[PDB]
Amino acid sequence: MTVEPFRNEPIETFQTEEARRAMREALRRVREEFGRHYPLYIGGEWVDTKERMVSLNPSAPSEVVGTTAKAGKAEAEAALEAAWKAFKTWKDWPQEDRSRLLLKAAALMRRRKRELEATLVYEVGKNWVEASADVAEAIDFIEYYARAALRYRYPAVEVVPYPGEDNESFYVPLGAGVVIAPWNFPVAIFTGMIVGPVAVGNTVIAKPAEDAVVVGAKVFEIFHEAGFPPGVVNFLPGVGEEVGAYLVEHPRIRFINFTGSLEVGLKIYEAAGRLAPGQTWFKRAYVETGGKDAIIVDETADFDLAAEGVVVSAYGFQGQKCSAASRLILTQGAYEPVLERVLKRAERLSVGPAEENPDLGPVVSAEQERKVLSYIEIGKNEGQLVLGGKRLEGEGYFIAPTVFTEVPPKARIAQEEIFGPVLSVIRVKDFAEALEVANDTPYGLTGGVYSRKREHLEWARREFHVGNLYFNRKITGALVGVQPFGGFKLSGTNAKTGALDYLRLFLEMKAVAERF
Amino acid sequence: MTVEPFRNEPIETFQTEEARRAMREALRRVREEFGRHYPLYIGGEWVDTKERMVSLNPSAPSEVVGTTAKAGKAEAEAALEAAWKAFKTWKDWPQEDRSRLLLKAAALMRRRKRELEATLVYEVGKNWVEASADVAEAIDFIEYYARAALRYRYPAVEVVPYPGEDNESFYVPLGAGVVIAPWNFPVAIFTGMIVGPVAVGNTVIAKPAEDAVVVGAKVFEIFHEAGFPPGVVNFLPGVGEEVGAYLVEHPRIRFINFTGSLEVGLKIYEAAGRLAPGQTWFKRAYVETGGKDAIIVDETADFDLAAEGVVVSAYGFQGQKCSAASRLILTQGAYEPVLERVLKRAERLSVGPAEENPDLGPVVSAEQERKVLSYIEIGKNEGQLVLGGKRLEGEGYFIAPTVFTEVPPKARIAQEEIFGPVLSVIRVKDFAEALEVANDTPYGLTGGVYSRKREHLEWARREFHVGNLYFNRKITGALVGVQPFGGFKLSGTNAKTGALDYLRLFLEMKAVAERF
Amino acid sequence: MTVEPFRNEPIETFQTEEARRAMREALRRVREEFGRHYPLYIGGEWVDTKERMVSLNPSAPSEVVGTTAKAGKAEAEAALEAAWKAFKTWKDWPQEDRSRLLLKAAALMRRRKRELEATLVYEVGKNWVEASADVAEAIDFIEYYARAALRYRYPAVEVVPYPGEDNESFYVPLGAGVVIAPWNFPVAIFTGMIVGPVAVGNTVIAKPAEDAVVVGAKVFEIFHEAGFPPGVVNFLPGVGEEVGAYLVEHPRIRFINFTGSLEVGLKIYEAAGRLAPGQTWFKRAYVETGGKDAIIVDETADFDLAAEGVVVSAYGFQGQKCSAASRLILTQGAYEPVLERVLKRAERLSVGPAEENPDLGPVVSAEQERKVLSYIEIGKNEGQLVLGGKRLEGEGYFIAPTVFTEVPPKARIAQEEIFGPVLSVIRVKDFAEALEVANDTPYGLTGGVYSRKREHLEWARREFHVGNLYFNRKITGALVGVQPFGGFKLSGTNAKTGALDYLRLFLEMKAVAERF
């Protein structure tokens, strides 16, 4: 290697005066910047449009964080032309050259770290630390994929030799594809889904989520300054069901990288399986679709340690994470002790404008608020409400940390992804039944077990069917490189991000033999 | 990694009827082409000249084996322009591509093996087996270097990482250089010295020895058919002192790869150290300059095995090898037993036209004959002639296997390289004195020890100062890859051919750092 | 390994009170030591002489930092006898034993770090940080070569196996050689050129530069305390053209390791190519001969970052570095913005006695002052003087940072190494022409490019023909292990210091086969 061994970007806690000072100034500059307009980015240049996308401050929705241009079918076609044209030469860049480009991008992102975090606080309502972890993760994706990509450099395939011939197998990129990102990790997942494919030679048209178009534009400012060739990466903020669907169904889109709801993921995967008119390849579609994550606690666990991890896992970023603990499965012996600790901890959580660095900020939008409050009403008819369950006063979309107990395993609130600060507690007899209930959902993304009994931990290691399992610690915050992230069942296609395998998904192999 | 592991090309022994049949047919085809004229090869095409070179059959010098063009200064300049023009793009070829080209050349040579061996027999007087080993070695050089070159591909240097930077070191070729080859291994060494530098990106101007211009041209027929780009390899048969010296002293020759006499090697090394008018680099000159190799035998040895190895080493190819055993150092207890056995074996050696596969063919030329006969006369005044020492009947330059005994260590025939079938026998007290006499010459190429005493063998491993040492076996016929070949002291610059280290000599290193 | 992974010795910045305190005390003790006399070091003992070498303080030349004995031909012969005698056994030391000796030497040097830096400040006029980097580099050479040498331990050569035989190839040291060092890095390069050869079994006679004999003696005090066997390393301060030339031309000197001017390097390389009377080997000569290093800046660069790097690169240690940026090539779009920033930065540079830790100390000697002022006069007739260009008031050899602009690419000041604080600015149309001008000098040591355009950086990576290339950072201060140091063309033989390959230059290979 020609760079130092990968290390995860430290997540800022803001305990020191220097950190608080830097963050206050970043928050103030971003705030003073409200209302700014960001154009589309196609073929290496910013391109404006007549229509626009508006991004509001979830902590005070009367405030416009900023606006962006709006991509329709015409802009989609333009981006496609630029991306395919760019692919023609981008695919031939030595891998070392492409990786150095990503490393430059990571360096530029790191320098604008505070600013990006501040933008997350205002645009999507993350408190300070949640914002810091998001940006740190994005930096990690770039650093990790830059190095990982070199493991696939020409000619990387291990083959069996043959007398009188040279037999060489190597990987080549797929082409131009589309990236459709979520709003909950608008810098991290947005960046990761883009730079992975791009690092190995693909070109990308990125479609940021409606609620996070501004931070997406700022990421592209970094790509532009880094110097990615025209067409290699394109920014197309717009409506998913419109320009997003258009690209997914397009005959000239080689692959689709998607992270979001199961509803949309199911549509994309189905569409990808169809041969659009004139299409000349079988589309590849990678989808990460969330889950209904549970944390199990048995009577041998450290109850205080468990309650702490459950609260962090269930309410971090208002429970708006595909990794969030939305289910708490407690064995008979641990039910009371753990539930009482969880409630005492959760009732002390603060809720307020994200800029104030509360424990919980607001949910991301009115629509999200509607969805979460709606599930709370359903919950009142399925389980026992024992904490919160209501909207708080204020313009922002504030929902109090909520807890339902005595919830039936097959209740809607114990099966459907709510994506809000709502925890469903399920009582079970023992560990065996705990695993039963844990596995009995259509998902399989994250999971956790708090227990001191080795046999239960090792049993879960083999039988708790989730892609990311954690013992005696929070089940959120998967670190790039450390914990390959991706699930099973309806949580997606198991495309592990922050793992060597991720890049192989954006490559195809060629075997060339020469008989001398 | 994309081809089978390296293996040495089997040396044909002609023990089967099919092998003999094939050789007889190759000999017929080759002699039926004795009238052919081979032009120069410059910039991808054969270019003829007014003057010419004539090659005779040393087994019947009135018979012409062929003629070639004769390169002068004008042709040297033409080749130089073509080689530098080619270097500009040849240096940028992926190493994998350059290696495949060599592998193709090896495959072609292997298919024309009998034809080349037959040409060696008629042009330089090698018997069948010596001819076969020569061609097999050339094939080995191509196969080995094609593979070794890949160990230096971009970016191959191991460096220490530094924070915030990419530090990449890699190898790059030198440019255009001249290869000046000997007549004793006109296919193997001629091929090795050319393909080694070429394999890693350099371009070469090859100047074959006057006595083997025809077989040198046939090697280029192979290079041409293999498809080396115009200018990469150039064929310039001509007078060493003329065209050879012109290139060596030229300010635009980047390196010189030479194998031949010490006399010429010393001149070349001195010239290489000077800055010619307008020259913009420090020239690298690699010179292998023969030796005065000895085989030591103590009283614990298997005398029959030793006598066999001595005869093989001293008279193989009429002793015209830089590795030939020209000194036989015997301790008191081994003297009589060994000398009598060597004499009995040597007196049974046949001598005659090489095509009849005798034990010994003729020496290569009238000049060589004059030199050898002169040393024989000198020997008569320094030691006691006990075998041979006469020219044999026929126009061919046949000289009988010769043995001198009671030769003083510092005698001219015990110090100077005769390059003929002349073995000097020196008697010593013990092994320690044997090592002292072995080391006391200006040379250090090959050497051997016949003994069963482990302490004597391991002692020699450390104190017998020669680049290639052999225990209880012949000291000639070093195999590519198995025995890196090159010596110490006045035997040259220790450029180990058939070894990974050989290619490093034709590369320079660049270190590029990028601060992100 | 039996030691921790190599890490570069930290370069002291002296920002903390502890560092300033330690340095002030070291400077005071060295100063109080002025006038001390150091003898020659031959055969493990200090040997005085009648004549002496005088070392003055360039910041106040009336002060004698110290004096040393003076080696003539008689002392050279004595050192040669001691070095060859020492080689006899030193070559047989297990590599692990030799490396541990170097590690001990490094530990002793590290403990006397402040003292050595202080000696550099007074003897050669380096400010505090330049002095710190010099000593840190020396420590790095010892630490790096100690480990690197183990990679060559018996039996290190990868060979192809053969049926019924043991085939073992291994490296052995060359013998006793001479090291001729420069005055600009009298601890670093002096140490590196000595310990590299010595680590693998060679013995050395070291000839320090006239202006840095005292610090050279202090290095030998460390070697002595470390315990290198008598004769392994010898200290011979004296006149280069006298005792230096004597050793270079001597028939019993096996190799020459030289760093200095191109004029002397050319003479040494030529002499090394000659066979002195009675010489029994082909001499090896490694020469690093400086350069005419340029930094290129295009219109896409961070002009502030570039101006800062240019000033550090051009004036660090008064531009008395073979790596110093003596040329600034600016494209049309970057000319004005960068030149104005360079001038504003350079005009603020302080000049004064090195002990005061100014930005620039004095040039090293009266002769150097004469040479630099002379080139300034030539510059006034070739380009436009826009800053400095004069001597400052004081006894010390102080020259103001100088800048010439509108300099013709082929002007003497844009082609010849001035080795002073003189920068030549060259205006060009674009990057293509920038590379043209950059490569058009007889040298090829260091180079740099400030640019944000990936295509220009990657183009330079392959076409800016210098051994050490840096992007968006200073082109001086190559770190051992991180950036193999050595150039192309007339900058030397490309012997990369602080790289694994460096040690191979002081070894020759032996292949020993045993047929069972």
Ligand SMILES: [Cl-]
């Ligand atoms: Cl599982």
Ligand SMILES: [Cl-]
């Ligand atoms: Cl030896």
Ligand SMILES: [Cl-]
């Ligand atoms: Cl280069």
